[PDB]
Design a protein around this ligand. Structure first.
Ligand SMILES: Cc1cc(-c2ccccc2)[nH]n1
Ligand SMILES: Cc1cc(-c2ccccc2)[nH]n1
Lengths: 285, 285
């Protein structure tokens, strides 16, 4: 077999596997439960992003160990992955979909505002805070995430194009819509949550999965969707748009009539203050 | 005014400006002339590329100083920039064009073979070895150059595209033709050398420089080009192709009938052994 590093061991009492390998552990100082993600020897860039982000719907780094393997100490999410709530045609309640999606939009909006594109949004990277259906969700796994920074295209455009290739000038029209990939993913997530099935699949189809996606022709099953509201499906349709320039942004999605739900918003604010009740320092007044 | 760093000063006797600021200097050890490029405080990446490249038509780093400014010690090219031979409608002899272009193709072929895209090829970055028209040329300024490495697209394609945005699947067709930007630039260079004028310009034209380039509709002046061979112009036409997938590669260009010139090839081999006569260590036999 093999051992954990002395420095990890010094600080945490390592326990059972949760689900990259993720294990349960206990901070010795606090006796509190943590999740430790092991990555066998991009991880530095992931730590750099996660250290600077600060949102209740984005996972927080608690510690990091650069040993024979990387060890990332994260906050423990007792509800597990959202994937385990959607597998085997399991259909989430329309209201539960909204509460979770609203949080995913808030998290992805924060990311975009801060110049971060996740690039790998799926149910397996959306964690639930408790075994309760009305709970806080957090976006995890920033391993494939990208930083928007300062484009080499903006620098190239400052010059004279005497020697500039045409394809570079053609890319100017689309440039800066990479974040739209995160809205596609959210749309595929919302579809799976609402219906219990994926929009693009090789199951009972002749058309290749690639052709389905490029044509943006999702598998629509009327019997399944008759249970879902017209508003929920309208948002799906608006995110599953092929043109990344026309596709709905996180701001447009958050403005959609489906998310204009004062009850759902109240429940989220309530879950937030319930979580925050622990951190609560006395107020000035 | 201001001073040079003690470490630079220790090794070189700094002299007159040559032309980023480039100054003449003398290595104290050898009493030999060098060119020192000063960059005021990407430069590390430029040094990393230039340290690993090894071709007679690519400039070599001799030293580097990371001071209040960057100081890059390069080999001195007495012929200066090719730009100074093409300004003010100055037309290079068809044979001189070939000798220089053949070397530019050999240099750019080496770059591509080694996973480097220059991204800023122009007459001002092509240096001449002597004041003689039959001379060795060297490609300089790797400041905007890029490394091909390991694409995130190849990593993304290893997964299932259930959640993958359509535009990512659409980019798969063009992916890996970025090097073709270097062949466009060479084509714009060859045109300027042969004709004395640029193919795409705002001078005596209604059509925007952008529109000219995307349509690939170069300004063709028959009287000017009647002096130039049909073969020379055929190669230009093959490099000034809008589709980066159809555009001529450095290998295709080097195979073109215009470069199938045994005389031109002989003269280059002769200039090479003339340069190499100094470095010459005794042979084993
Ligand atoms: C980063 C992380 C992973 C987890 C987790 C907890 C239980 C089951 C599955 C996953 N919490 N936090
Ligand atoms: C890198 C470099 C620059 C030069 C140079 C020499 C004379 C005139 C203009 C430029 N040689 N090498």
């Amino acid at each position: 077999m093999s051992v954990y590093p002395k420095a990890l061991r010094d600080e945490y009492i390592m326990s059972k596997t949760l689900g990259g390998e993720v294990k349960l552990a206990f901070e010795r100082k606090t006796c509190k439960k943590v999740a430790i993600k092991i990555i066998s020897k991009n991880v530095e860039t992931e730590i750099e992003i996660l250290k600077k982000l600060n949102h209740p719907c984005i996972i927080k780094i608690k510690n990091f160990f650069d040993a024979e393997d990387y060890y990332i100490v994260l906050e423990l999410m007792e509800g597990g992955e959202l994937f385990d709530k959607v597998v085997g045609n399991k259909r989430l309640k329309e209201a539960t979909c909204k509460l979770y999606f609203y949080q995913m939009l808030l998290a992805v909006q924060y990311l975009h505002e801060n110049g971060i594109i996740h690039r790998d949004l799926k149910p397996e990277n959306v964690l639930l805070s408790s075994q309760e259906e009305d709970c806080l969700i957090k976006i995890t796994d920033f391993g494939h995430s990208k930083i928007l920074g300062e484009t080499s295209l903006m620098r190239t455009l400052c010059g004279t194009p005497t020697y500039l290739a045409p394809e570079v000038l053609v890319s100017v029209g689309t440039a800066g819509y990479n974040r739209a990939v995160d809205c596609w993913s959210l749309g595929v997530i919302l579809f799976i949550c609402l219906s219990g099935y994926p929009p693009f699949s090789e199951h009972r189809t002749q058309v290749s999965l690639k052709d389905q996606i490029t044509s943006g022709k999702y598998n629509f099953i009327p019997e399944v969707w008759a249970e879902v509201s017209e508003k929920a499906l309208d948002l799906v349709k608006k995110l599953l748009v092929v043109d990344p320039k026309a596709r709905f942004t996180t701001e447009e999605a958050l403005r959609h009539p489906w998310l204009q739900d004062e009850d759902m918003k109240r429940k989220f604010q309530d879950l937030l203050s319930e979580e925050n009740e622990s951190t609560a320092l006395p107020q000035v007044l």
